[PDB]
Design an enzyme around this catalytic site. Structure first.
Site, PDB file in Angstrom:
ATOM      1  N   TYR A  26      -7.256   9.962   0.165  1.00  0.00           N
ATOM      2  CA  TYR A  26      -6.213   9.528   1.079  1.00  0.00           C
ATOM      3  C   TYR A  26      -4.836   9.489   0.428  1.00  0.00           C
ATOM      4  O   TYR A  26      -4.685   9.562  -0.794  1.00  0.00           O
ATOM      5  CB  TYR A  26      -6.518   8.128   1.597  1.00  0.00           C
ATOM      6  CG  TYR A  26      -6.107   7.034   0.633  1.00  0.00           C
ATOM      7  CD1 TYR A  26      -6.737   6.888  -0.601  1.00  0.00           C
ATOM      8  CD2 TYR A  26      -5.093   6.144   0.956  1.00  0.00           C
ATOM      9  CE1 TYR A  26      -6.366   5.900  -1.480  1.00  0.00           C
ATOM     10  CE2 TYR A  26      -4.717   5.148   0.079  1.00  0.00           C
ATOM     11  CZ  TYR A  26      -5.358   5.033  -1.135  1.00  0.00           C
ATOM     12  OH  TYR A  26      -4.990   4.041  -2.012  1.00  0.00           O
ATOM     13  N   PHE A  36       4.098   4.887  -0.144  1.00  0.00           N
ATOM     14  CA  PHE A  36       3.949   4.108  -1.362  1.00  0.00           C
ATOM     15  C   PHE A  36       2.745   4.492  -2.204  1.00  0.00           C
ATOM     16  O   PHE A  36       2.756   4.221  -3.409  1.00  0.00           O
ATOM     17  CB  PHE A  36       3.868   2.607  -1.045  1.00  0.00           C
ATOM     18  CG  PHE A  36       2.864   2.260   0.010  1.00  0.00           C
ATOM     19  CD1 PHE A  36       1.539   2.036  -0.316  1.00  0.00           C
ATOM     20  CD2 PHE A  36       3.252   2.138   1.330  1.00  0.00           C
ATOM     21  CE1 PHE A  36       0.621   1.723   0.647  1.00  0.00           C
ATOM     22  CE2 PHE A  36       2.336   1.821   2.301  1.00  0.00           C
ATOM     23  CZ  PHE A  36       1.020   1.614   1.955  1.00  0.00           C
ATOM     24  N   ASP A  37       1.710   5.091  -1.623  1.00  0.00           N
ATOM     25  CA  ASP A  37       0.484   5.366  -2.353  1.00  0.00           C
ATOM     26  C   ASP A  37      -0.049   6.740  -1.991  1.00  0.00           C
ATOM     27  O   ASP A  37      -0.007   7.150  -0.828  1.00  0.00           O
ATOM     28  CB  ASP A  37      -0.585   4.319  -2.059  1.00  0.00           C
ATOM     29  CG  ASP A  37      -1.756   4.408  -3.011  1.00  0.00           C
ATOM     30  OD1 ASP A  37      -1.640   5.105  -4.040  1.00  0.00           O
ATOM     31  OD2 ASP A  37      -2.796   3.780  -2.728  1.00  0.00           O
ATOM     32  N   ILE A  56      -9.602  -3.001   2.439  1.00  0.00           N
ATOM     33  CA  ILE A  56      -9.076  -3.677   3.613  1.00  0.00           C
ATOM     34  C   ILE A  56      -9.758  -3.112   4.855  1.00  0.00           C
ATOM     35  O   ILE A  56     -10.113  -1.925   4.908  1.00  0.00           O
ATOM     36  CB  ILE A  56      -7.540  -3.549   3.654  1.00  0.00           C
ATOM     37  CG1 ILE A  56      -6.934  -4.421   4.750  1.00  0.00           C
ATOM     38  CG2 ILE A  56      -7.094  -2.099   3.782  1.00  0.00           C
ATOM     39  CD1 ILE A  56      -7.354  -5.867   4.684  1.00  0.00           C
ATOM     40  N   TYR A  82      -2.961  -7.222   5.742  1.00  0.00           N
ATOM     41  CA  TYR A  82      -1.885  -8.001   5.117  1.00  0.00           C
ATOM     42  C   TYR A  82      -0.910  -8.548   6.165  1.00  0.00           C
ATOM     43  O   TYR A  82       0.245  -8.133   6.253  1.00  0.00           O
ATOM     44  CB  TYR A  82      -1.145  -7.176   4.059  1.00  0.00           C
ATOM     45  CG  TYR A  82      -2.032  -6.389   3.132  1.00  0.00           C
ATOM     46  CD1 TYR A  82      -2.806  -7.025   2.173  1.00  0.00           C
ATOM     47  CD2 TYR A  82      -2.081  -5.005   3.203  1.00  0.00           C
ATOM     48  CE1 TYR A  82      -3.615  -6.302   1.318  1.00  0.00           C
ATOM     49  CE2 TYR A  82      -2.884  -4.273   2.353  1.00  0.00           C
ATOM     50  CZ  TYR A  82      -3.649  -4.924   1.415  1.00  0.00           C
ATOM     51  OH  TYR A  82      -4.450  -4.191   0.571  1.00  0.00           O
ATOM     52  N   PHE A  99      -1.691   5.943   7.859  1.00  0.00           N
ATOM     53  CA  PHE A  99      -2.399   6.561   6.756  1.00  0.00           C
ATOM     54  C   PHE A  99      -2.558   8.052   6.999  1.00  0.00           C
ATOM     55  O   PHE A  99      -2.105   8.598   8.003  1.00  0.00           O
ATOM     56  CB  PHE A  99      -3.761   5.902   6.555  1.00  0.00           C
ATOM     57  CG  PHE A  99      -3.731   4.756   5.606  1.00  0.00           C
ATOM     58  CD1 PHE A  99      -3.193   3.542   5.993  1.00  0.00           C
ATOM     59  CD2 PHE A  99      -4.232   4.890   4.325  1.00  0.00           C
ATOM     60  CE1 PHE A  99      -3.164   2.482   5.117  1.00  0.00           C
ATOM     61  CE2 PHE A  99      -4.202   3.833   3.447  1.00  0.00           C
ATOM     62  CZ  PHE A  99      -3.666   2.627   3.844  1.00  0.00           C
TER      63      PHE A  99
END
Lengths: 107, 420, 123, 48
Positions: A26, A36-37, A56, A82, A99
């Site tokens: 991913y 960010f990732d 999560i 979150y 995502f």
């Protein structure tokens, strides 16, 4: 709850069951397109277990609709990832999680 | 608040030489269609996903510079308001994704063929993927400039073009009224592919630096072009008779003899005897067209008068040759004017003379609703000579120039002086 | 700075307006910090001020400046139209439709880059 | 708004290659090797 807008499915015969590996390659994205990732850059596919409650849950139950080889731009509500605290220092609270996932093999 | 940092890929785009615009005097058609098939694509050659979009873009303003750009960069088709595009599941215009509702939708796999609609009468651009239509169009846009198709592609992508039966092959039926884009090519330019606004070119001698290119203008397709003097009507018969005396012998050497029927292979010409030996409109084909070329002679400010009328009958005509005798034997003597030779003020004027008569025809021809192609469409009233004069090729430009030269060089050889 | 009456502001003038090779053209003047709406819409009195979500700014053209050649409004960052014969016709605006497969149209939204008004529409 | 300004020439351009594969298929174009570059944001005006 989440929704899933797929990109390109694969086999379609297989779906994640209990007691299985789940190897994903991913990336991530905040809602303004500011990522960010990304596990793709460091060349190590993310390998999380099913049902063990270590990821999560928006990533978890959203992965249930996935098939083998399926690529799908999903999303997540603030309440599933979150909610009011955020990840401290990285993402602010009350923010969605767009995502971009795809499953490699082994369900 | 701070400067973020990330990696990003390179990207570029290419176009073919098709530039369809719209204006008041429009010699073109106004609705077009094209297909592009995809045979080889890798989604992940790097950490960032590959980029591949197909669409339409304006001329003067779609300027993809390769390094960086706007938004986050890697800018291609759809990153501004100068382009519109599609990629498999998104409409792209102005650097914002617009989703689709397409049956069997996915991003572009190999062996996937796209097709796009283009209309200029109604402002509308839509797409059709694998024969199936998509749920959206593009309207209300400006039209200040021509339009070309493009494909904006990132690294590691092999794609193929379909233009028309001379080069490509269409794998789907065109919609009603949409011409294949291979015929919109201008005749002076052979069709090719090129990058948009190059400045570095590779070559032998270790690269090449080019400046800005020169594009075709928006209203560059629009074509554009009195009293009667007393002696001009007196020379309107004398010029048109000697022109008919030269109209007979010129067609006589090519084959056309005295025949009151109209054919080319049978070679039957009705005015292959003399000027008075022609029918009444065929003589007026030389007479009544001369009032038009004389009403524009004073409209260009060219000073000319009835000068040197002494040797008009003293200095005789050309010699009627043995081969100048036609199949009916008729051979009038054209008044040759080899004693008066080329002058550069007249030679520059006779280019501006011979262009003006053809160019004013092009408006009056296309006033009936004529349109352009690179081939001949007789029931669609399309002609491969439906362009202004400097847009034509020099071979056809040579044809309708020397036909007017002998109409002037004999008259300037009659002493009627040409002034600029 | 502004007074207790006038709020603070900033103006701009023209030094070389008279003779000796003056320069007058069209010039395109925008501010430096943007505003951005939220991710989803709704769908005097201090109580309404602590809940309102709308803001206000203004310009003032000057007596002696012709208001037939003024245009105000807002613009997106992606804006590169530079010319000298600008009119409101010369505005890039593209509308995009979307609907069902059986012709049942759903929405038709318009893209732009600027959002201008003609200043001569009030004189 | 000023009309022109400077920028940097990137040191490596991507390898594009065009050809015409017969009168049946048409024109084709391909590329194989990828090239990348770092970027800034300037987030208050969104141009890299």
């Amino acid at each position: 709850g989440v929704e899933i807008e797929t990109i390109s499915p694969g086999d379609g015969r297989t779906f994640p069951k209990k007691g299985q590996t789940c190897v994903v390659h991913y990336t991530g994205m905040l809602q303004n397109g500011k990522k960010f990732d990304s596990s793709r850059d460091r060349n190590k596919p993310f390998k999380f277990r099913i049902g063990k409650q270590e990821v999560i849950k928006g990533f978890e139950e959203g992965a249930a609709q996935m098939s083998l080889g399926q690529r799908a731009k999903l999303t997540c509500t603030p309440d599933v990832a979150y909610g009011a605290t955020g990840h401290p220092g990285v993402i602010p609270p009350n923010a969605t999680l767009i995502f971009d996932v795809e499953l490699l093999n082994l369900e | 608040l701070l400067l973020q940092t990330n990696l990003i890929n390179y990207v570029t785009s290419i176009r073919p030489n098709i530039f369809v615009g719209r204006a008041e005097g429009s010699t073109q058609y106004g609705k077009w269609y094209f297909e592009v098939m995809v045979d080889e694509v890798v989604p992940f050659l790097t950490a960032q996903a590959t980029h591949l979009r197909v669409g339409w873009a304006l001329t003067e303003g779609y300027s993809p510079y390769p390094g960086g750009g706007e938004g986050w960069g890697g800018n291609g088709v759809g990153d501004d308001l100068y382009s519109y595009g599609f990629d498999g599941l998104h409409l792209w215009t102005g650097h914002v994704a617009r989703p689709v509702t397409s049956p069997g939708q996915h991003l572009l796999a190999p062996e996937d063929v796209v097709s796009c609609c283009l209309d200029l009468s109604v402002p509308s651009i839509s797409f059709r993927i694998n024969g199936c239509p998509v749920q959206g169009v593009f309207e209300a846009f400006n039209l200040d400039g021509l339009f070309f198709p493009v494909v904006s592609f990132s690294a590691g992508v092999k794609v193929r073009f379909l233009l028309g039966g001379r080069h490509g092959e269409f794998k789907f039926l065109p919609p009603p009224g949409y011409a294949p884009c291979h015929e919109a090519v201008l005749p002076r330019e052979r069709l090719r592919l090129e990058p948009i606004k190059e400045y570095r070119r590779e070559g032998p001698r270790g690269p090449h630096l080019v400046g800005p290119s020169r594009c075709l203008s928006h209203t560059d397709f629009v074509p554009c072009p009195i009293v009667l003097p007393p002696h001009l009507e007196r020379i309107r018969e004398k010029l048109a008779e000697n022109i008919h005396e030269l109209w007979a012998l010129t067609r006589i050497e090519q084959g056309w003899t005295y025949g009151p029927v109209r054919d080319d292979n049978k070679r039957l010409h009705p005015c292959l005897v003399n000027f008075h030996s022609l029918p009444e409109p065929e003589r007026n084909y030389n007479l009544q067209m001369s009032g038009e070329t004389l009403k524009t002679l004073l409209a260009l400010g060219c000073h000319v008068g009835m000068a040197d009328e002494k040797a008009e009958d003293n200095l005789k005509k050309t010699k009627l040759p043995k081969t100048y005798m036609m199949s009916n034997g008729y051979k009038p003597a054209p008044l040759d004017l080899s004693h008066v030779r080329l002058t550069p003020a007249q030679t520059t004027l006779v280019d501006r003379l011979a262009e003006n008569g053809h160019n004013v025809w092009a408006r009056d021809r296309v006033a009936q609703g004529w349109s352009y192609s690179a081939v001949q469409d007789i029931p669609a009233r399309r002609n491969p000579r439906l362009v202004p004069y400097r847009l034509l090729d020099e071979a056809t430009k040579r044809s309708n120039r020397d036909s007017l030269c002998q109409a002037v060089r004999t008259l300037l050889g009659y002493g009627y002086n040409i002034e600029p | 700075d502004g007074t207790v009456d006038t709020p603070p502001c900033l103006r701009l003038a023209h030094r070389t307006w008279g003779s000796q090779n003056s320069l007058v053209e069209m010039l395109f003047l925008r501010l430096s910090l943007p505003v951005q709406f939220h991710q989803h819409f709704r769908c005097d009195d201090p109580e309404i001020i602590l809940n309102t979500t709308t803001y206000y700014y203004s310009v003032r053209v000057f007596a002696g400046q012709e208001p037939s050649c003024v245009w105000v409004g807002w613009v997106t960052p992606d804006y590169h139209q530079h010319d000298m014969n600008f009119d409101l016709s010369k505005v890039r605006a593209v509308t995009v439709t979307m609907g069902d497969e059986q012709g049942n149209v759903h929405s038709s939204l318009k893209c732009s880059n600027c959002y201008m008004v003609w200043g001569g529409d009030f004189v | 708004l000023m009309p022109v300004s400077w920028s940097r020439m990137p040191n490596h351009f991507l390898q594009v290659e065009t050809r015409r594969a017969g009168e049946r298929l048409g024109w084709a174009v391909q590329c194989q090797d990828p090239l990348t570059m770092m970027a800034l944001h300037i987030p208050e005006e969104n141009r890299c």
